């Protein structure tokens with residue numbers, strides 16, 4: 271498999287995932303200024319801006335490593351926030367809508 275078409279696919283997939291995050295609540299790292307306790311139990315924060323930087327640093331060389339960091343965005347949010355919050359439900363919705371995006375992208379990758 272060739273590297274450039276694969277990264278082109280990951281770039282498109284990342285854009286499709288960001289489109290599902292309409293509030294842009296996962297676009298950038300969680301502000302530790304407003305959430306000073308966030309690192310107490312979130313051992314690896316993740317967000318789409320960080321994912322873009324990892325992508326361009328050639329840190330995602332297979333679909334699973336890309337998908338793992340997306341799942342981290344979701345799982346961090348479910349962990350930190352109470353179930354009755356907008357944040358928690360936004361993570362549920364992203365898990366649902368992003369899973370469909372990821373399944374189609376992986377089918378495209380496996381054709382390579």
Ligand SMILES: C[C@@H]1Nc2ccccc2NC1=O
Nearest residue numbers: 295300301304305347350357
């Ligand atoms: C991910 C999401 N972002 C955020 C921004 C500002 C305050 C708290 C949060 N908590 C979150 O989980």
